[PDB]
Amino acid sequence: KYDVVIIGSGPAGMTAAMYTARSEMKTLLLERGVPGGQMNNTAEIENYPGYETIMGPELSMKMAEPLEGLGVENAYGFVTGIEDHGDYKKIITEDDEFITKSIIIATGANHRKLEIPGEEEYGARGVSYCAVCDGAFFRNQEILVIGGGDSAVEEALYLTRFGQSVTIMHRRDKLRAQEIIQQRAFKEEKINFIWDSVPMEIKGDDKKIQSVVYKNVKTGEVTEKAFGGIFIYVGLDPVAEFVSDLGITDEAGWIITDDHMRTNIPGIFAVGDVRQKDFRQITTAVGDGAQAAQEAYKFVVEL
Amino acid sequence: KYDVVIIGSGPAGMTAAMYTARSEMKTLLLERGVPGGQMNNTAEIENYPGYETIMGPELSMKMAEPLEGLGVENAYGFVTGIEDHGDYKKIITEDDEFITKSIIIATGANHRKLEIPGEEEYGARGVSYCAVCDGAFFRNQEILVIGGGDSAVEEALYLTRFGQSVTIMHRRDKLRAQEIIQQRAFKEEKINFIWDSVPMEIKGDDKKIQSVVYKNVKTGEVTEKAFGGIFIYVGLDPVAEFVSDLGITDEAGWIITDDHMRTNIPGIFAVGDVRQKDFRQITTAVGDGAQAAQEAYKFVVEL
Numbered sequence: 001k002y003d004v005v006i007i008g009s010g011p012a013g014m015t016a017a018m019y020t021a022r023s024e025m026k027t028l029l030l031e032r033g034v035p036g037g038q039m040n041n042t043a044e045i046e047n048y049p050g051y052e053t054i055m056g057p058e059l060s061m062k063m064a065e066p067l068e069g070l071g072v073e074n075a076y077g078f079v080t081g082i083e084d085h086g087d088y089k090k091i092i093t094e095d096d097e098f099i100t101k102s103i104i105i106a107t108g109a110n111h112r113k114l115e116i117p118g119e120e121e122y123g124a125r126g127v128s129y130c131a132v133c134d135g136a137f138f139r140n141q142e143i144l145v146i147g148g149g150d151s152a153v154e155e156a157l158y159l160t161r162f163g164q165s166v167t168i169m170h171r172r173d174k175l176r177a178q179e180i181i182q183q184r185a186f187k188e189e190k191i192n193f194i195w196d197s198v199p200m201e202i203k204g205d206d207k208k209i210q211s212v213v214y215k216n217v218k219t220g221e222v223t224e225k226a227f228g229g230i231f232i233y234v235g236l237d238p239v240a241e242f243v244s245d246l247g248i249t250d251e252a253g254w255i256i257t258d259d260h261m262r263t264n265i266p267g268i269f270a271v272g273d274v275r276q277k278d279f280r281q282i283t284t285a286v287g288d289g290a291q292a293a294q295e296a297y298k299f300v301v302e303l
Numbered sequence: 304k305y306d307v308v309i310i311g312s313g314p315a316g317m318t319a320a321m322y323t324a325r326s327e328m329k330t331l332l333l334e335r336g337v338p339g340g341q342m343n344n345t346a347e348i349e350n351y352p353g354y355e356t357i358m359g360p361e362l363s364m365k366m367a368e369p370l371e372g373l374g375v376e377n378a379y380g381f382v383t384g385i386e387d388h389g390d391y392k393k394i395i396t397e398d399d400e401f402i403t404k405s406i407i408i409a410t411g412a413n414h415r416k417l418e419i420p421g422e423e424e425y426g427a428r429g430v431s432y433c434a435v436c437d438g439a440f441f442r443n444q445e446i447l448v449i450g451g452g453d454s455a456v457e458e459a460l461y462l463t464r465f466g467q468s469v470t471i472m473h474r475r476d477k478l479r480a481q482e483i484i485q486q487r488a489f490k491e492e493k494i495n496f497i498w499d500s501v502p503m504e505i506k507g508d509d510k511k512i513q514s515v516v517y518k519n520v521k522t523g524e525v526t527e528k529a530f531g532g533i534f535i536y537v538g539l540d541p542v543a544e545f546v547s548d549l550g551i552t553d554e555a556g557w558i559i560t561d562d563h564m565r566t567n568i569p570g571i572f573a574v575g576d577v578r579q580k581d582f583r584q585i586t587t588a589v590g591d592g593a594q595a596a597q598e599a600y601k602f603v604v605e606l
């Protein structure tokens with residue numbers, strides 16, 4: 001009944017829906033939240049070709065805007081499962097079922113957790129995974145960022161608008177972030193580093209975070225230091241629970257595809273961050289999405 | 304000496320250079336002409352996520368604009384050859400040589416020719432391969448477009464601003480273009496079709512085109528019809544003469560890569576339209592380019 005259903009309206013899914021709709025495929029785009037995906041949790045995007053800089057939420061709106069006019073059916077849905085029935089597939093959300101000839105899974109990735117004490121307890125009260133979301137709640141605080149990657153370092157740099165200081169704690173003595181971002185963090189006077197360290201415990205009073213205990217990974221030296229906020233950026237897990245059973249994931253839960261965005265199951269494609277891959281960016285999400293769309297068209301024509 | 308040299312400043316090459324420069328690789332971007340590549344020969348771009356519509360040359364400028372600020376070295380160069388010397392590579396232009404650790408080839412594709420009589424003779428005087436380039440020279444003419452693909456049909460639609468009428472001649476009875484563009488051409492009152500036909504001869508007086516002779520591919524019926532302009536969009540050839548000898552091309556001359564944009568020759572990557580692939584768009588060019596950039600970084604770090 002749908003030619004294609006796209007699950008997730010981040011940049012991969014929005015690109016795919018734009019393309020399927022231009023191919024006049026009957027297109028359903030399901031999203032649990034706000035179109036834009038991780039882009040909405042991104043303050044400034046510098047490396048999307050075609051924009052010198054642009055706020056994540058503005059790029060989200062620009063990507064969402066033509067979709068209605070092209071005849072994409074945009075709908076709310078949290079997807080809980082998918083059944084392969086041979087010549088059709090069924091998609092299960094909280095309340096609805098949808099039948100379709102093909103599926104493009106574009107549901108992205110989610111913050112990994114430290115799984116340390118205080119991490120859950122300080123939940124609403126000092127622990128965050130989203131700096132553009134929570135940054136202004138930490139005006140004048142000493143903020144701690146955990147991680148060494150693009151997200152830790154960029155979001156640290158963002159957070160310097162708010163904090164007295166921002167400290168990045170990384171578990172080695174060299175960051176993984178893009179060098180241009182490293183160099184910016186090195187030069188920024190409000191950014192400090194705790195190298196070769198991992199956090200062990202997050203501590204506070206009944207109401208909020210007050211300190212972190214951490215360990216040096218080369219010496220075992222243990223230190224406890226006062227901080228008012230902790231932002232955690234230690235990498236990503238796939239958001240693919242609704243396909244656990246289907247035999248299309250690796251051990252860690254990422255969706256495996258070939259270079260044409262095809263899974264095992266014909267008519268089920270995956271794009272963007274949910275895929276088993278190493279390079280997670282808006283550019284490659286958009287690329288994945290275009291590719292899936294064209295492959296889905298081929299698949300449905302040949303059905 | 305260069306960490307990476309990128310040959311071609313269309314969207315694939317401009318994305319790649321932006322990424323290598325952000326990785327602080329010493330980056331040379333060589334282009335024979337104007338940054339933008341095929342985008343500069345494109346009137347309206349509707350399917351670049353992030354823009355509802357934008358003129359090709361405007362998107363070109365937006366993609367070129369940050370490159371200088373990031374420290375990309377932009378230079379004129381027409382590349383004539385490349386030599387693999389193991390731990391470095393040398394690039395040969397008309398006058399210069401450049402030594403680099405890695406190469407990203409982003410030189411795109413070029414219009415295929417009909418190879419029919421009058422095609423060369425009417426060269427400057429009625430035959431064109433670029434509608435945004437030549438369209439206004441055909442105000443009030445009867446224009447003929449040859450081909451059935453995205454480029455024939457879009458550029459026909461563009462040309463209706465100028466011509467009394469535009470006729471699309473396709474060699475089958477179904478277009479290959481995206482359905483949304485087909486539907487627009489069907490509904491446009493200034494567009495006519497000659498189906499199941501191929502052009503055989505282009506004719507004119509000493510000074511200009513006056514008529515085309517064509518043949519119906521199912522009946523052999525031959526017809527001659529007056530037209531003032533002929534725009535030819537019958538597909539693409541690779542622009543990769545400078546690597547003919549290197550064993551990285553297929554029979555037709557497209558550069559073969561794996562899904563990480565790697566050729567045979569380590570440290571030589573290819574991206575975008577020059578690659579052996581089926582799906583040629585700005586989205587996948589940009590995706591290819593990002594991927595190559597990250598792979599080149601890995602390669603040069605490991606050298």
Ligand SMILES: Cc1cc2nc3c(=O)[nH]c(=O)nc-3n(C[C@H](O)[C@H](O)[C@H](O)COP(=O)(O)OP(=O)(O)OC[C@H]3O[C@@H](n4cnc5c(N)ncnc54)[C@H](O)[C@@H]3O)c2cc1C
Binds near residue numbers: 010036108273285
């Ligand atoms: C802080 C930060 C900064 C970044 N900055 C940049 C940058 O500057 N440049 C760059 O190129 N990349 C950047 N990235 C990476 C980039 O944002 C992602 O690569 C990209 O958004 C991936 O898009 P995607 O469409 O695959 O997934 P996502 O954007 O993750 O979209 C997934 C969507 O699927 C929806 N979804 C999930 N589960 C379900 C379900 N069960 N049912 C229905 N809907 C569901 C989610 O709500 C979401 O909207 C950044 C990432 C982060 C975290």
Ligand SMILES: Cc1cc2nc3c(=O)[nH]c(=O)nc-3n(C[C@H](O)[C@H](O)[C@H](O)COP(=O)(O)OP(=O)(O)OC[C@H]3O[C@@H](n4cnc5c(N)ncnc54)[C@H](O)[C@@H]3O)c2cc1C
Binds near residue numbers: 316347348350457
């Ligand atoms: C009429 C038309 C309309 C189009 N419309 C759309 C659209 O709306 N949306 C879409 O997604 N795609 C569209 N495309 C396809 C899109 O433009 C291409 O997919 C894309 O530009 C490919 O980019 P690329 O960087 O691989 O190659 P190109 O843009 O082809 O860039 C190649 C560059 O390499 C340079 N170069 C070549 N040889 C050499 C040399 N020997 N030395 C130095 N430099 C060299 C050339 O000057 C050129 O600038 C269109 C194509 C055409 C023809």
Ligand SMILES: NC(=O)c1ccc[n+]([C@@H]2O[C@H](COP(=O)([O-])OP(=O)(O)OC[C@H]3O[C@@H](n4cnc5c(N)ncnc54)[C@H](OP(=O)(O)O)[C@@H]3O)[C@@H](O)[C@H]2O)c1
Binds near residue numbers: 197
């Ligand atoms: N501008 C952009 O293009 C941009 C922006 C943001 C994100 N992204 C992309 O999005 C993807 C996710 O990025 P990411 O930064 O979230 O994740 P990431 O690349 O996985 O990096 C996570 C970082 O945290 C470190 N880490 C892990 N556990 C730790 C701990 N317990 N204590 C301290 N440090 C710890 C990792 O260490 P090791 O380095 O030792 O593994 C790594 O440096 C990546 O592909 C990234 O490039 C892109």
Ligand SMILES: NC(=O)c1ccc[n+]([C@@H]2O[C@H](COP(=O)([O-])OP(=O)(O)OC[C@H]3O[C@@H](n4cnc5c(N)ncnc54)[C@H](OP(=O)(O)O)[C@@H]3O)[C@@H](O)[C@H]2O)c1
Binds near residue numbers: 539584
């Ligand atoms: N908006 C966009 O995204 C966009 C715009 C333009 C181009 N592109 C992409 O750029 C690439 C090139 O596009 P294209 O349109 O230039 O080439 P194309 O997809 O190769 O199509 C060429 C068309 O001309 C036909 N043809 C070939 N020889 C012919 C002849 N002698 N007489 C009449 N018709 C003839 C072909 O016929 P058959 O169909 O019988 O082969 C085909 O329909 C494609 O991947 C395309 O999708 C994208």
